[PDB]
Amino acid sequence: AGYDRHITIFSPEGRLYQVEYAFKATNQTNINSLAVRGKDCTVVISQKKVPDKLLDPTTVSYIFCISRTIGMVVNGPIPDARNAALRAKAEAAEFRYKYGYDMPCDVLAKRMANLSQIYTQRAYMRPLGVILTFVSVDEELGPSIYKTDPAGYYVGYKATATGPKQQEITTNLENHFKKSKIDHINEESWEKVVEFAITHMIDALGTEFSKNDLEVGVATKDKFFTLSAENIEERLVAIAEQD
Amino acid sequence: MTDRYSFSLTTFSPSGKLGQIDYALTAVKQGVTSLGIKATNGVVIATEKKSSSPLAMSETLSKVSLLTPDIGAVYSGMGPDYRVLVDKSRKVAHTSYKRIYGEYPPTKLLVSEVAKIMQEATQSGGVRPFGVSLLIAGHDEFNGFSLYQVDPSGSYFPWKATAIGKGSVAAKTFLEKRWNDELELEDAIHIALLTLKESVEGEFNGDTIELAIIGDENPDLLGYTGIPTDKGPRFRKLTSQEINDRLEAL
Amino acid sequence: GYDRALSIFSPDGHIFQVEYALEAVKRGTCAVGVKGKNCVVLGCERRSTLKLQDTRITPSKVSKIDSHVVLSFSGLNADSRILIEKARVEAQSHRLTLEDPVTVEYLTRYVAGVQQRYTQSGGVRPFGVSTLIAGFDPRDDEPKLYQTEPSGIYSSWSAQTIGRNSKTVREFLEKNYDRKEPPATVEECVKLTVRSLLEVVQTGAKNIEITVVKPDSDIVALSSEEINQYVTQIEQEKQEQ
Amino acid sequence: GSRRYDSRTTIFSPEGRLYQVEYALESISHAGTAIGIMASDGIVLAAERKVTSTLLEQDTSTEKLYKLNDKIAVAVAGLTADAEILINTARIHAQNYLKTYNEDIPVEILVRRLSDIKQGYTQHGGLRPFGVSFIYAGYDDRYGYQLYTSNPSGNYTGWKAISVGANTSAAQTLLQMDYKDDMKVDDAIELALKTLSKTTDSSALTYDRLEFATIRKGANDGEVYQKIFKPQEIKDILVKTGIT
Amino acid sequence: MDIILGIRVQDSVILASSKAVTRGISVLKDSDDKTRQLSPHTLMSFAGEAGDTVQFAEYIQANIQLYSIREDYELSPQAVSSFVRQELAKSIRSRRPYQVNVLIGGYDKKKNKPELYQIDYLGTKVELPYGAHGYSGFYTFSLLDHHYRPDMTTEEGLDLLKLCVQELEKRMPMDFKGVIVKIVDKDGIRQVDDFQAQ
Amino acid sequence: GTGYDLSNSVFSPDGRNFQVEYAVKAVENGTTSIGIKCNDGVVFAVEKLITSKLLVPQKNVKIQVVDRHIGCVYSGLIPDGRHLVNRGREEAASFKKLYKTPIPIPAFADRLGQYVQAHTLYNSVRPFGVSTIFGGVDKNGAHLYMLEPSGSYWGYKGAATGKGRQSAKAELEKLVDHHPEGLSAREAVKQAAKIIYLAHEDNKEKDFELEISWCSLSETNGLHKFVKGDLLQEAIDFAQKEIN
Amino acid sequence: DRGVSTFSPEGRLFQVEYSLEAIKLGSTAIGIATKEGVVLGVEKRATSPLLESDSIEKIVEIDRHIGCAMSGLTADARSMIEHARTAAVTHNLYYDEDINVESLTQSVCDLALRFGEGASGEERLMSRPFGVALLIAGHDADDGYQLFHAEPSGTFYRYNAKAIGSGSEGAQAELLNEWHSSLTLKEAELLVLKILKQVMEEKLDENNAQLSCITKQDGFKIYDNEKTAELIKELKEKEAAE
Amino acid sequence: QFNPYGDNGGTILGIAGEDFAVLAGDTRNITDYSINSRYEPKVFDCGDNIVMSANGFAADGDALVKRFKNSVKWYHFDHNDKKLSINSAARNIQHLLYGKRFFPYYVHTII
Amino acid sequence: FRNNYDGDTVTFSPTGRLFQVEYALEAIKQGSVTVGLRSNTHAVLVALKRNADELSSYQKKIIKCDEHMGLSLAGLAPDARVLSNYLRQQCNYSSLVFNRKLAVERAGHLLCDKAQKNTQSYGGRPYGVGLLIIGYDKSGAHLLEFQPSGNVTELYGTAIGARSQGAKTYLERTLDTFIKIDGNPDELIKAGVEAISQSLRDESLTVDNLSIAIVGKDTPFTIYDGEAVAKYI
């Protein structure tokens, strides 16, 4: 009777607590992230917090390279994040082999979302405590952002934010778009779109960042890559010379 | 590993109730309203696109899906469940029919196949029922136009018009008033938009609404020409613009 | 897939599922079997919870396994079928491989085995059934009567009964059946049977069915009248005193 | 492990009962009433459509009467979805018999298989039983017109007249009151409608809430014929038998 | 091959089957009954591959007896032959197919008519007034085609048959050691124990 | 409610997985073991408690090798540790068989990670009761890693787990600061023997036995090897000295 | 509930322990070994006068030189005896010799713990342990006359005399005194008969009790009613003799 | 095509005395017209006073002897180091051989 | 508490314990004492055999796995048969495939890994038996102690079972002495018998209750029972 809270079956209210608690787990890392679309690029920013001195900072990341074109940032525990990453990478490699063309960001999101939907219905699979944000510059849809959650839900966004302070980040962005009247950052270069991202991340969170406080990924026509502490610093120095 | 959940997760309670199915239904009542109206020359299914974030792009998510070129579906309840159900539906229409007979299945039969898939999730080992109810509308040369409703139990029934989800009770009542056996498709679309209005709180426009119809054949939407007997799909999803133009004569 | 151990031991050394299976038997209609000096008779009662049935088609209680052996039972009807089918199949298979019909004891040992197996196998519950198997071994005239239960245990009886109120009718039989001199007549044997059933049937001309088995595959089920006649000659025995 | 959430749908109660079957039946007892009456020259199947609306399309609806064969049909009481799974396997079974022997499947043979399927979900597999009860009305050249019934338990029996679903107790009593062996199909048809009419939880017994079927031997032929009445045919008969 | 003959007269079916059993250089038996009773009013004769022959017949027998016990009824001759065809047709595409040919003679107690069915190892089934498997027909069909009449008596039948068996003893190369004859009618199956000089 | 800690793959209302957390307890209760990443390789060391004079000295080796270039050491349930190494050996063998090149250390880390994470997805399995420090030298230098029962793992400069894990972390952190330019293999061996002696204070009751292994490009040729004989006794002295 | 292969805090397997309980309720069974052969006796225990007492088989032949007696849920013992007979026969086929009594026993015991719902070690398919014990008696050229007690636990012991079933504890205590290495077969016969009589609720006759033995010369034989009756009589006389 | 069989020549002899027995064999192993070895033992002591030799195709012959010796080993484990009688060994060897009835050990074995 | 975490082995307690395994471990303490010790030339096993009645026999405690390896048990007799049989196969496999005697240390690893499999997967149960393995291989004489938890250890000597702590102290005490009993098996055995007697209480070791096994340099693993062990009582 009360075990409707331990496995993925309905509660009398028509709810799935385990899915809810999975969502809870996504914040374990206490890290926020956001993504935005440029005129022809897509950027994802995520906080990076490496407090232990014994850690090799370079081996710490929640941004993944799924394919030459798809990049994925994860909000949730690293072990589940890595399980998801590996799967998506496999799903992408396979898709190319079978259908003859690179798997589109939205399709990979759907496929991953469906996989999640299953853990929601089958009782022996637990959901993954993660929220996956996929980004790229689709050869058909252009800059793309698609995120999926432990519920098996997913959708595309103009821009998006995820983490403990998701709301603060979101409304900041909402505002900016209500203003600009367009569904993207009208910028030709990605360096500028990245700067826009870091800037609004700062405004919304009311925090300043050093080069080791962030993690950045950029998706362009036929290539997704991540920035280095230095690539970042350069970007940080730039916004500083505007304030 | 190895799924050891070989037993039923939905069983009979002493009162004769099948809990999980009941709960599933509950989950459906919580869902956003969606409806269907059958006219003499067409059917219409519609629902509200309850964007879950102003940053989301409502179009990237469709609640009204084409199953075959003459069958459409809409739901109320759990989106993810409905999504996989739509893929299974589109596939079963092929594997269990088009691949045997060389023609798409007739509405009642596809609906029946979908229903079976759900029924199984009600008795098979280690799973929970689907938390959704569907409204499938289609047309086939021998049965004409039809509209069906499929529940988490696997039950289904034919309707002239109906609604499910949040405001089903109210909406169903408004339909019983305005419906008759002499409606033309445009009328059903009109009644459709009117009915949906009551259920919608905030913005009501071609961007917050999703509506499709099963009507005439769309040769212009076929993609090729040269085969007389192939005239085009009867299923057509209205555009944001098409919706708004209508909202003006609302 | 499903292999949960449904029949297991409890502290006191019991296997409740098998015991509860026996409970199902107690609730079933009564069945009795008495062997004569050259025949065996089986009788079963007919419930009355509802009456408007079609006796022509409604499955009867005494089933033929082979032309010389029959099986009646008390307990769940759905369950009995599975046992009857398996028994009938094993019967033909035995003829096919050994070139000789099964002995009554063998057909019994087989049915009993199937039941026992369902008490120590995963994912299955025991048959809520007890059976009476009777007939004549091939080319033999010594009547055979055996009984089996959910546990899988079995043995032979001069006369026996199972089902509701079996306690009663057994008592009757224990003080109405002499091994020294068993019913030397099919008639006097079918009489003792109907007499024993009447102790519990509470006047049931149509509530009582009988089947007589004679040596060499001679099995026939009596009709209401034939039976109703026995009932009559019996109620007079009472009044005439 | 998983044992923790295993309901154990196939076990005996201390009284030797099968919980799920019992409960399944309890479920069936709330389903629209279904009646089957067997006359000397035919059989009648009548069922009450549970839950209806002005909008519910009736010409296209068939929630209780399904044709299995050309000579067998069933009336359902319980989960429609569960029913269909069983219905379909039955239809296959009839065709396999025909493909093997070149003879239509005898009515009991089909009923025993379907019942056996049910019996199974009762003894193994850890699955829930089918929440369905069937009234089989069919005809064969060995027992002529037959009327059967099977429930979640996997047991089946033959009847002259019977009902399944809601208010069976009341319906049974009424049939056991006016049924006579010499009855003619039309007499049975009339008795059937009367019984429902008196056991309905509804206000009046209208056609839109009914499904009807008859397996008679159209004298002008020499062969038997199944007929599932259409909305208008039910509407007509309703007026004639005096229920208007 | 062996002689498997069948002829359906007015009120019965007659089955004649050679008695010889040869294994290479030696004739092992001269009293072999190439028959199996599937039910009180249904008899099946057979010929073909060494092991398969009986293995198939007995397998069919077992199954028809099981159907009888279970339904407490005797399947029509037509139904039995259909079952038998289905089985051979399966064997034809199996790993190791039964190489058997059969004649099924039965009396339909419901139709009250005798019936003869011919079925080969491929599952080719046909109903006939008279028939035979192997080469037997090559010498006998001309005789039957000529003298056969639908209303013949069981006695006339056995005569036209004796006539056929003589042609076989005259023109056929092998010594089949005579035939064993059997009649299936409204009363069942019986063996004409005196055909060695009838 | 409660009981969110009896089944392995269950999320508690606050998003945790207690079974994994309880696994960690078994780890913390284990012997202390560490890893130091030097400028061209890695060093591994572990505490071996002398439960009694009866244990043959130097005989119950704890550190294991994977392939020829990887070293593994763990704290917690030893058998669970061996099990994990066996999988690692299979994992590395499979990889080499197809790609020819011996498995890169980072790739190896994820193989173990994915495997250990797998034992937190079902209730039919128990999570691993060990934390594992492992690493080696490959095409891109040295790599040191530590894997948690949760499946989590990261790259480290220095790593410690077990009973005396705090002392170790303290001492390791010091090294990091006092050597911003790197530590040598030879030096990490000494520094490792010291940290173990220091961390042995949180278990100062039972006498212990030190065990060290290393994988240095210049000292071992990139192949994992056990520090024995003189270089060993030498580090034992450097430690025995600085502990007084 | 709780796994069928779980350990108690005392280090015992629950299902096995409970198994042993059902056995205590079983009909008495006794075995005595003597350099002249081994005797096996059992308590029929008919649950009614209408039950033909000789259709009660609680002493069966494994092989010509091996027999056994059972106590507990006797239906459970059917497959155990099948395995046992097949083992004895198979060994002969593969080695052209008789199976040693101990090996036969070890073989039966090996099925004992083959139960569970998915126990890691092979494919133990059997939902519960057996609810019956056995006294395996036989003779072989290696260790001559032998008596074995095999339990659902999977273990077995060799005894000179052993009693299992409802009357055991008392009967065993008795045996402890009555038995001596110089017993004769006949002596053993009476002793078994006597102890059965003492623990049996029923007045021991040749219909609710059965005797049998196994000797090198004639192997395993089950005494027919007449033969036992006389031994019973012969016993009453010797007893009332003092 | 691939032929799984070969011939290594050799010849063996077994003679039984009243209270003794002998098993002999040349020690030459060959392949066609070439000598593989002038000394390659072919007769083996398998314990329990049993000598054996599987002559013909050496790969098969070695396989068999090895398999039999192992059978003796387990016979001791299972039956308390009980001596395996020659007759029993013979029956056991029969099963070893017939076990590969449809892809035999191409050897003529004598014990 | 414990009640909620000891239903199987796939469950950790709040403190990181595995009760089902701990319970299994108990079965050993409840078993009959057995001792093991070795010098540089030999490895010895001494065991106290237990009986049921005085009409029954004494349970064998020592099993031979190969000509150079064997063990003694304490706990579930069946499990010891299962494990010793698996150890026999491994010894056998090493010989057939590699013509190599299985190293005692290696056997120890295999046992460990096998035991561990029944402590992490649903359905299985830990083995409820302790084992003392002795063997002479390429690196001399060895003694291993096997625990159902999977922990296998190499020692100079040890003991398991009831009152075992007695002998273990005696050995831990005599160590420097017996470890040097090379080239004299009879002594090593007397040293083993003296150790095991430090765990007696109920009775004194008799001829049909004492079980001794030995293996060494030029000594195939051999067992002594009855009169065979008379010269040591």
Residue linked to tokens 């092991």: E51
- In three-state form (DSSP H/G/I as H, E/B as E, the rest C), the secondary structure along I71-107 is EEEEECHHHHHHHHHHHHHHHHHHHHHHCCCCCHHHH
Q: Which chains are within 8 Å of D by 3+ CB pairs?
A: A, B, C, E, F, G, I
CB F116 within 8 A of CB F128: yes
CB B71 within 8 A of CB B90: no
CB A146 within 8 A of CB A105: yes
DSSP for chain E, please give it: ---EEEEE-SSEEEEEEE--EEETTEEEES----EEEEETTEEEEEEESHHHHHHHHHHHHHHHHHHHHHHTS---HHHHHHHHHHHHHHHTTSSS---EEEEEEEEETTTTEEEEEEE-TT--EEE-SEEEETTHHHHHHHHHHHH--TT--HHHHHHHHHHHHHHHHHH-SS----EEEEEEETTEEEE----TT-
Provide the residue ranges of all domains of chain I, joining segments of one domain with +: 1-233
d(CA F171, CA F35) in angstroms, rounded, equals 12
d(CA B87, CA B66) in angstroms, rounded, equals 10
D124 vs G: CB within 8 A: no
- How big is chain F, counted in residues? 244
Question: In Å, what resolution does this model reach?
Answer: 2.8
d(CA I171, CA I159) in angstroms, rounded, equals 9
D9 vs B: CB within 8 A: yes
C-alpha closest to that of F159 among F42, F22, F27, F28: F42
SS3 label, residue B250: coil
Structure tokens at H87: 């007759």
Distance to chain G for H88, nearest Cα, Å: 5
H98 → chain G, closest CA residue? G94
d(CA B64, CA B82) in angstroms, rounded, equals 10
Nearest-5° angle of CA B53, CA B59, CA B65?
Answer: 120
CB F19 within 8 A of CB F33: no
Strand residues in chain A grouped as ranges (E): 33-37, 42-47, 63-65, 71-75, 131-138, 142-148, 154-156, 159-162, 214-220, 223-226
Q: How many CB atoms lie within 10 A of CB A68?
A: 13
**Which residues neighbour D231 within 8 Å (Cβ) at sequence distance 6 or greater?**
D58, D59, D207, D208
Structure tokens at E198: 């009838």
Centroid of chain to Cα C77: 13
C-alpha closest to that of B97 among B138, B127, B130: B138
d(CA E50, CA E53) in angstroms, rounded, equals 6
Structure tokens at A150: 């432990």
Q: How many CB atoms lie within 10 A of CB I173?
A: 12
Contact D2 A3 (CB under 8 A): no
d(CA A81, CA C43) in angstroms, rounded, equals 71
d(CA H47, CA E82) in angstroms, rounded, equals 65
Phi and psi at residue D241, to the nearest 5°: -55, -5
C92, C93, C99: best to mutate for the E interface, most E CBs within 10 A: C92
DSSP for F139-175, please give it: TTEEEEEEE-TTS-EEEBSEEEESTTHHHHHHHHHHH
The parent domain of residue F156 ranges over 1-244
Q: Please, which residues 207-226 of chain B have a Cβ atom closer than 8 Å to chain D?
A: none
| Sheet strands side by side (includes C159-162) | C159-162, C31-35, C40-45, C208-214, C218-221
Residues ending a continuous segment of chain F before a break (C–N > 2.5 Å): none
Inter-axis angle of helices C186-201 and C166-174, to 10 degrees? Answer: 140
Phi and psi at residue D177, to the nearest 5°: -100, -35
d(CA G37, CA G160) in angstroms, rounded, equals 11
d(CA E120, CA E125) in angstroms, rounded, equals 7
Q: Which CATH architecture has domain C1-241?
A: 4-Layer Sandwich (3.60)
- Taking CB atoms and an 8 Å cutoff, what residues of chain A touch B25? 14
Any contact of H with E, at least 3 CB pairs below 8 A?
no
Strand residues in I19-167 grouped as ranges (E): 34-38, 42-48, 62-66, 69-75, 129-137, 140-146, 152-154, 157-160
Domain count of the fold of chain F: 1
d(CA A20, CA B98) in angstroms, rounded, equals 40
* Resolved by: X-ray
Phi and psi at residue G132, to the nearest 5°: -150, 145
Contact I157 F54 (CB under 8 A): yes
* Cα distances (Å, whole numbers) of residue B48 to A151, B75, D117, F130: 20, 10, 44, 52
**Which residues neighbour C230 within 8 Å (Cβ) at sequence distance 6 or greater?**
C190, C191, C194, C210
Domain count of the fold of chain G: 1
- How big is chain B, counted in residues? 250
- Taking CB atoms and an 8 Å cutoff, what residues of chain B touch D81? 115-116, 118-119, 122, 153-155
Structure tokens at A171: 């409304």
C-alpha closest to that of I176 among I155, I190, I156: I156
d(CA D120, CA D110) in angstroms, rounded, equals 16
- Taking CB atoms and an 8 Å cutoff, what residues of chain G touch H91? 94-96
Q: CATH fold of I1-233, please?
A: Glutamine Phosphoribosylpyrophosphate, subunit 1, domain 1 (3.60.20)
> How many CA atoms, within 13 angstroms, populate the side-chain half-sphere of residue B103?
11
- Taking CB atoms and an 8 Å cutoff, what residues of chain C touch E70? 85, 88
Residue I169 corresponds to which amino acid?
T
Any contact of C with H, at least 3 CB pairs below 8 A?
no
CATH of the domain at G155: 3.60.20.10
C-alpha closest to that of I11 among G4, G120, F127: F127
**Which residues neighbour A214 within 8 Å (Cβ) at sequence distance 6 or greater?**
A45, A46, A47, A48, A198, A232
Span between the terminal Cα atoms of chain G, in Å: 58
Nearest-5° angle of CA C125, CA C127, CA C132?
Answer: 165
Distance to chain G for D6, nearest Cα, Å: 9
C-alpha closest to that of A126 among B191, F137, F11: F11
- In three-state form (DSSP H/G/I as H, E/B as E, the rest C), the secondary structure along H66-103 is HHHHHHHHHHHHHCCCCCCCHHHHHHHHHHHHHCCCCC
- Nearest residue, CB atoms, D124 vs list C50, C53, C123: C123
**Which residues neighbour B37 within 8 Å (Cβ) at sequence distance 6 or greater?**
B43, B44, B147, B160, B161, B175, B179, B183, B188, B189, B191, B192
Structure tokens at G28: 């008495």
Contact A12 B23 (CB under 8 A): yes
Structure tokens at C56: 């022509």
- Nearest residue, CB atoms, B15 vs list D26, D54, D57: D26
State the catalytic residue, choosing from F2, F31, F32, F132: F31
Structure tokens at A237: 């120095």
Distance to chain G for I132, nearest Cα, Å: 19
Residue G54 corresponds to which amino acid?
D
Pinpoint the alpha helices (H) of A12-129: 17-25, 78-99, 105-121
Q: CATH fold of B1-250, please?
A: Glutamine Phosphoribosylpyrophosphate, subunit 1, domain 1 (3.60.20)
The parent domain of residue G76 ranges over 1-242
Q: Which chains are within 8 Å of B by 3+ CB pairs?
A: A, C, D, F
C6 vs D: CB within 8 A: yes
d(CA I132, CA I46) in angstroms, rounded, equals 10
CATH 3.40.50.150 fits domain E1-198: no
CA quadruple B102, B103, B106, B112: dihedral sign: positive
SS3 label, residue G81: helix
**Which residues neighbour D124 within 8 Å (Cβ) at sequence distance 6 or greater?**
C2, C123, C124, C125, D10
Give, as one character, the DSSP assignment of residue I51.
B
C-alpha closest to that of G13 among C18, I126, F7, C19: I126
F5, F7, F19, F125: best to mutate for the D interface, most D CBs within 10 A: F7
Contact B53 A8 (CB under 8 A): no
Q: Select A1-243's CATH number: 3.60.20.10, 3.30.70.3420, 3.40.50.2300, 3.40.50.620.
A: 3.60.20.10
Q: Which residues of I touch D (CB under 8 A)?
A: 8, 10, 122-123
Instruction: Compute the radius of gyration of chain I from its Cα atoms.
Output: 18
C-alpha closest to that of C120 among G59, G150, G117: G117
Structure tokens at H12: 């063996």
**Which residues neighbour D82 within 8 Å (Cβ) at sequence distance 6 or greater?**
B119, B123, B154, D130, D131, D132
CB A65 within 8 A of CB A71: yes
Region of residue D166 (left: phi > 0; alpha: psi -120 to 50; beta: else)? beta
d(CA G54, CA G64) in angstroms, rounded, equals 21
d(CA G27, CA G21) in angstroms, rounded, equals 13
Q: How many CB atoms lie within 10 A of CB C147?
A: 24
- How big is chain I, counted in residues? 233
CB F60 within 8 A of CB F31: no
d(CA D5, CA B6) in angstroms, rounded, equals 11
d(CA B148, CA B112) in angstroms, rounded, equals 10
SS3 label, residue D174: helix
DSSP for G125-189, please give it: -BSS--SEEEEEEEEETTTEEEEEEE-TTS-EEEBSEEEESTTHHHHHHHHHHH--TT--HHHHH
For F57-93, letters b (16+ CB in 10 Å) and e give eeebebbbbbbebbbbbbbbbbbbbbbbbeebbebbe
**Which residues neighbour D86 within 8 Å (Cβ) at sequence distance 6 or greater?**
D114, D117, D118, D130, D132, D134
C-alpha closest to that of I48 among I217, I209, I229: I209
Q: Is F220 a catalytic residue?
A: no
Q: How many CB atoms lie within 10 A of CB H34?
A: 6
d(CA G22, CA G15) in angstroms, rounded, equals 11
H69, H77, H80, H82: best to mutate for the I interface, most I CBs within 10 A: H77
Contact H70 I96 (CB under 8 A): yes
Contact G100 H82 (CB under 8 A): yes
d(CA E67, CA D127) in angstroms, rounded, equals 31
Any contact of G with H, at least 3 CB pairs below 8 A?
yes
CATH of the domain at F84: 3.60.20.10
